[model samples]
Target chain A: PTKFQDKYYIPVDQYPDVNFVGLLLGPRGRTLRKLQEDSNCKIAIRGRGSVKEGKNASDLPPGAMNFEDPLHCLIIADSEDKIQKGIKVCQNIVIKAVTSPEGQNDLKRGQLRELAELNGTLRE
Target chain B: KFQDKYYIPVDQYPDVNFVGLLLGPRGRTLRKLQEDSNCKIAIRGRGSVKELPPGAMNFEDPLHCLIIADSEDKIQKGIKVCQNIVIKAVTSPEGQNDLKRGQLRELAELNGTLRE
Candidate 1:
């Protein structure tokens, strides 16, 4: 059953520098249609804030960088296979993003440890 | 082998229905759609996807069709057969009533002509 308290997190390491992005369900037709036309199959996940709920933590603005705040997520992939490919790409993007900010290597290690606990596997 | 492709939009239908269709297809290829992907599907009776608001109705998602057959020549014929079947169901007097809930008298008007 879907539960509110059962907050789903995509582990920090999965994206190394990226935070948990928003979750998506079902085949988005526009993206899939492009996949069919281009014979492409990959997805890129980006995080954002929630726009509907309005809570700052949940406030997701339209067309924002996915991990700008961790409240929203975006996906760009052609097929199921592509989605998997995007996940790995996102991990690298996140790692590169956080390296220059805060404490450098310190935050990277924490992100890696968190990534391990989250099973490094995708979840809804 | 024969195959036809369909493009289904994720924003069109309920999550469960989308998952169910994704559960089958492409030689029962529904297995390829991951639970986390923002994929969605619809029940046949429902209308278009972009016209709906969140939580407005029980059925809003839409699904595309992709039927595969044994020979390349059978692709068009096979789709026609399936299309005819759905067309007949919606045209029946009883079926029409059920679809419109006594709203529109001409259900067949909305159905497209079919040939086998």
Candidate 2:
């Protein structure tokens, strides 16, 4: 019954060197454009400051390395269904980024605990 | 993409060559600004878009510079650099001023800056 416009963060924040902005946009924003095309949504990658007047930290946990400096994204869509789809697509792309290397030793501690639970089967 | 449009007063500065200044020699200056800021800039106006297809022309148009970027900071940087160039050109005429400004900017680069 309502449009979906929310503040959110990606899950790959465990790595100190992750480029959340670059990963989301990819090679001149082609990745972002593609995501928008299929999901029918608008995404704004706000690095570390501000959002709509009445909002608080959109996503928790894998927040900024410094908790006070939380990064955010404004995902806007006309319908709740499309909004959820946007978040799912964003999730898949973001996960695809950090999953590239052998964080397996840390799987033993590197990647976030939430995603690694099904690493083997999901990697399948 | 996040976008910002700077309206170029094509009619206001009729005698000055802001467009030419915006698009330096072989468009090098504009390209450098785009690369520096991570933004895609498009120069749009009646005279500028003449070479482009008719579909490129929309209904109500402004002789403006379009800055498109994935990040808000980049868009702001793009706008600032372009604004400086256009404003300088408007206040000063073409030819010697641009050549002088170019040399000055080059010197400023030696100090890791863009003109004073």
Q: In model 2, how large is the Cα lDDT of residue B55?
A: 41
Give candidate 2 regions above 4 Å deviation: A1-124, B50-59, B93-96, B99-116
lDDT of 2 by residue, A1-124 (tens): 4565744454333444666665566545566787888888887666453233345555533323333324545578987567656666765554445545545333223233324454543342
> Which whole-number lDDT from 0 to 100 does residue A59 have in model 2?
57
Q: What share of the true interface contacts does each candidate keep?
A: 0.00, 0.00
- Give a tens-digit lDDT track for model 1, residues B33-76: 22122123222324423343343345422244444556533544
Best by lDDT: 2
TM-score of 1: 0.19
Clashing pairs in 2: A106-A109, A106-A110
TM-score of 2: 0.39
lDDT of 1 by residue, A1-124 (tens): 2211111123342234543332121123232233223423333233333333344633434444344333312334434444333333333333234334445644344545555556764333
Superposed on the true interface residues, model 2 gives a C-alpha RMSD in angstroms of 20.0
Displacement of the residue B3 alpha carbon in candidate 2, Å: 0.9
Segments of candidate 1 deviating more than 4 angstroms: A1-124, B6-62, B95-116
